[PDB]
Structure formats: structure tokens, C-alpha cells
Amino acid sequence: TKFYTDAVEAVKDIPNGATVLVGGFGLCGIPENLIGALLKTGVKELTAVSNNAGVDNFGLGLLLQSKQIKRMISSYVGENAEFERQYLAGELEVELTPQGTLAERIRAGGAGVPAFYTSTGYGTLVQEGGSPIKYNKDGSIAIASKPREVREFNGQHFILEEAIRGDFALVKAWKADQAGNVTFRKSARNFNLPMCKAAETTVVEVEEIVDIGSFAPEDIHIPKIYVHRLVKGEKYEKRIERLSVRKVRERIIKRAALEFEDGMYANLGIGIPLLASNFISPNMTVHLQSENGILGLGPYPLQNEVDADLINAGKETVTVLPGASYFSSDESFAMIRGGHVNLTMLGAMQVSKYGDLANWMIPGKLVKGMGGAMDLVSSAKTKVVVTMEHSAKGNAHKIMEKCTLPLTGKQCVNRIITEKAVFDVDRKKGLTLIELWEGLTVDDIKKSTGCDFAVSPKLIPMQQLE
């Protein structure tokens, strides 16, 4: 590990057109001093592999502001209007990649694996191709994504994904010893760990440099072999994107809250699912998983508990309960993709008769990326429960024969909770109405549902947890 005192000196040899991996989840664990040094060097035409695009005026967005990035390989755009503008305008190329796939491909790229199989993205634009990579000025499409090869293993369909390797990696970490060993703090680890292994030259910035021997050798997160250039960061602004402090929808939330069991491992999506966790009994123990690499999510912090290094999947500041753990992004999606999480509960725009899901794209309106949504529904072992309003504007169908919006996954939903009904979903037999809201009838549900359904002989009135 070569030590540097000046960050510009550490990155001055990056060529134009280089592929650069950039650590960070939102603004959590971003290499802000190295990004700052790239503004000064002015290197351009970069293919930046990064999970998100930061915000409009910070993180990776700064390099979009200076037009130094040609292509983005990312999972979620988020709250970067400049990102969205440049992409829609035809100025920026963007490969929207499932977050777990992005993580595993970076890992493969550092672990000598050229390609591997995953069910994430099967039956979607990732697999079929045609995902817009570049737009023309006129509004038509310039570059579209190529299909991924499909292959069946053990009665199930998977797609082939190729390793991602960088010319450079720009990495943020908490501490480094004088030998070059590195550690990360809380959820600031995310993509920084795998990216540190998947590039020809890895440049790491750290908040503190400690003595050799300071780390327990078991607790070194990235061994020195992976760290090629090390710099102590001059300025750390501890920026927080979304402060979240503590001091008919309600119907869906209270029914969703009945999905939680004692000792359950759950990943809850933004909105209704996460709000349902408030109604969990104190006597019930539910461990909440976060895809950015946390197990054991707690409530939002009090003012004094706030931390830039600890955010949830929605980029909101959070806390952790006792017995929580932190891990890398590759590992978080190994967790998710392996079916280790008992319940995934997320919102939806559309569900089909056999459990196809659409919840990430509305063409020419919502193109922020899929995030970890496609990995979260990929396992058959994990119970996927959808929470949504029954019908759309003009009483248009959301539950239907076939989805009209782009798919997050095929035959992946196990249960649908709405304000009117609760449905069990089967991949072969279709929908079964198992709970019905009081005052409504089976005929009311039929004319709010775009496909037919069986009725359970033990149909009960819909439950609520108060």
C-alpha cells in the first residue's frame, strides 16, 4: 500500500474513458475527497460504476454537473434531478442494473469469476433486453440493453451475468492502519468493500490512520492486499440526505402488520410495509434487514442519535437495535437472493393472476431504476407480500390477467393485501380471496379486479391489528 498526503496525486493518472468504481450508498460511505480530486484533474468520458448518483450537488452528482461522466452503471437514480435530466436529454448513458446483481458482478470481477447465474431480472427488461441505455435528442432511443442468456437449473430459470472490473476504484473507509489494512463504520461499508477488490488500481480514503496492531486481525474488513493507494481525507462534511428524527392506507397498514411473526426476518419496503412495523407488539421480536447491509433495524433516531453512516434503504437516517450486524452489499444480496429473509413486503403498481409484479418503471414517467426490488422477489423460499390500493385512477385495474407495466419479476408474489381484500397467489392456480373487508361483497371485488379468482371456503372478514 502506497500512502499519499494529497488526494489529487493519488488519482492524477486516471485516463479519459476509464471505468471507475465509486463506493457509496446514497451519501453514506462516499469517497468525497477523491471525487473532489477528480473535479480538479478534470478527467472525462468516464464509465462510473456506482450504486447511486449521489444528490444533485454532492457525491457522484458533482461529476455529472461537470459532465466528466459518459456512462453510469447504477441500480437507483433517486433524488438527483440533474441525473434524470441528462439521462432523459440524451447526454448521459445509463445501464440500470439490479443492485444485488451489480454487487455480485463486482465481486465476481475481483474473485476471478467471469460470469455466473442469477434469477434476478428474469422475465424483465434486464433479461429480455430493450432497457434504455441512451436516448436520442429527439426523444427516440439511441442505445438499448442487450438480452441476457437464459438457462434452467433445477426446474427454474436463471440469467447469465458477467463480471464487472474497473481500471480504478474510489473507495471510502473509516480507518486504516499503517500496514494498509482497512475497516468500515456501520452502513458506510455497502459497495466499498467489494469494489475494493474489483479494480486494477484501488484508491482508498480514510477518516483516520491508526497504528499497526490497533485492529484485531479477525476484524480487518479489507486486508492490505486489496489496498493499493491510501490517503487520509482532508475534509469530511458528514452530509445527511434525509434527516428522519423521532420525538384507507391505515387499513392496509394494520392488516400488513398481521404478517409479522415472532423471530421473523423481514425486509420491508418504503411506505406502507415499513409503517406496518410500528404496529408490531413489544412482546414480538422481528429482525429487520436492510439491503444496504444492515440486520436489526430499529426506529428513527432522536436528535442526539443521528448518524451520517447509518441510513436505511430509503436513504433515511435510522438506528439499530441490540444484536444488530453490518455487512457488505454483495453479502446483503447473498442473504436476500439465497432466500434467508422470511418475508419481503413491498408496494406494487400492478400484480398479475399468477404473481407477476410491476413496481419499478412507468415508461416516459418513472425511470429511476429498480434498486434491489428485483433481487427481493427472486427467491421462492422468501414469502413476498404486496401491499397496495386495490384499484387505480378511474377505478382502473391494478390486479389483472397480465401486467401492462414493466415487470419486476414473474410469478413472485405470494400474497396481495389491499384495503378491500386479501388474496393468496399461486403460480399455477392463481388468486384466492381469503379475507374480505366488512361491508363489501365478492361481487364488489370482482368488478375491481381485472381477472377471475377462487373464493376460499373459510373466507373471514379482514383482520386489523390495533
Site residues (vs a copy of itself, CB under 8 A) = 104, 107-108, 110-119, 153-154, 156, 158, 162, 177-181, 183-186, 189, 197, 212-213, 215-221, 223-226, 265, 287, 289, 295-296, 320, 322-327, 333-341, 378-379
From the list 32, 84, 205, 291, the catalytic residue is: 291
Phi, psi of 37 (to 5 degrees): -65, -30
Write the interaction track for Cl ion spanning residues 142-161; mark x where CB under 5 A is met and - where it is not.
--------------------
Rg from Cα positions in the chain: 23
Q: How far is the CB of 30 from a copy of itself (least distance, A)?
A: 18
* Among the listed residues 215, 201, 276, 147, the one whose alpha carbon sits nearest the alpha carbon of residue 10: 201
SS3 assignment, position 345: strand
Q: What is the DSSP string of 146-210?
A: PPPPEEEETTEEEEEEE---EEEEEEEEEEEETTS-EE--GGG-TTHHHHTTSEEEEEEEEEEEE
Query: Which residues are paired to 205 by β-bridges?
Result: 172, 231
Residue 159 binds: one of Cl ion, a copy of itself, none (C-beta under 5 to 8 A by kind): none
Residues in the chain: 466
Give the DSSP H/E element, type plus range, for residue 231: strand 229-232
Q: Nearer to a copy of itself by C-beta: 113 or 392?
A: 113
Beta-carbon contacts of 64 under 8 Å, excluding residues fewer than 6 positions away, are: 53, 72, 80, 82, 83, 86, 92
Q: How far is the CB of 372 from a copy of itself (least distance, A)?
A: 13
Q: Nearer to Cl ion by C-beta: 19 or 97?
A: 97
How is residue 15 annotated by DSSP? P
* Among the listed residues 351, 429, 360, the one whose alpha carbon sits nearest the alpha carbon of residue 384: 351
Residue 76 binds: one of Cl ion, a copy of itself, none (C-beta under 5 to 8 A by kind): Cl ion
Phi, psi of 396 (to 5 degrees): -75, 150
Distance CA 279, CA 253 (A): 8
Task: Single out the residue of 132, 194, 371, 430 in contact with Cl ion (rule: CB under 5 A).
Answer: 371
Q: How far is the CB of 406 from a copy of itself (least distance, A)?
A: 22
How many residues sit close enough to Cl ion to count as binding (CB under 5 A)?
A: 2
Interface with Cl ion, residue 293, by CB under 5 A: no
Cα–Cα separations (whole angstroms), residue 310 to 11, 42, 276, 317, 362? 28, 31, 21, 6, 31
Residues in 375-434 that interact with Cl ion by CB under 5 A: none
Task: Single out the residue of 7, 47, 60, 76 in contact with Cl ion (rule: CB under 5 A).
Answer: 76
Residue with cell 458533482: 62
* Among the listed residues 413, 315, 430, the one whose alpha carbon sits nearest the alpha carbon of residue 359: 413
Q: Nearer to a copy of itself by C-beta: 110 or 450?
A: 110
- β-pair type (182-183, 156-162): unpaired
Distance CA 359, CA 408 (A): 6
Q: How far is the CB of 252 from Cl ion (least distance, A)?
A: 24
Q: How far is the CB of 9 from a copy of itself (least distance, A)?
A: 19
The residue range among 3-11, 73-81, 186-194, 383-391 that interacts with Cl ion, by the rule CB under 5 A, is 73-81
Residue 224 binds: one of Cl ion, a copy of itself, none (C-beta under 5 to 8 A by kind): a copy of itself
Active site residue 208: no
The residue range among 111-119, 139-147, 235-243, 365-373 that interacts with Cl ion, by the rule CB under 5 A, is 365-373
Q: How far is the CB of 447 from a copy of itself (least distance, A)?
A: 40
Q: Nearer to a copy of itself by C-beta: 154 or 304?
A: 154
The residue range among 12-20, 76-84, 109-117, 434-442 that interacts with Cl ion, by the rule CB under 5 A, is 76-84
Q: Nearer to a copy of itself by C-beta: 133 or 341?
A: 341
Q: Nearer to Cl ion by C-beta: 190 or 411?
A: 190
Residue 303 binds: one of a copy of itself, Cl ion, none (C-beta under 5 to 8 A by kind): none
Residue 218 binds: one of a copy of itself, Cl ion, none (C-beta under 5 to 8 A by kind): a copy of itself
Q: How far is the CB of 280 from a copy of itself (least distance, A)?
A: 17
Distance CA 252, CA 272 (A): 7
Distance CA 244, CA 263 (A): 27
Which residues contribute to the site for Cl ion (CB under 5 A)?
76, 371
Active site residues: 291
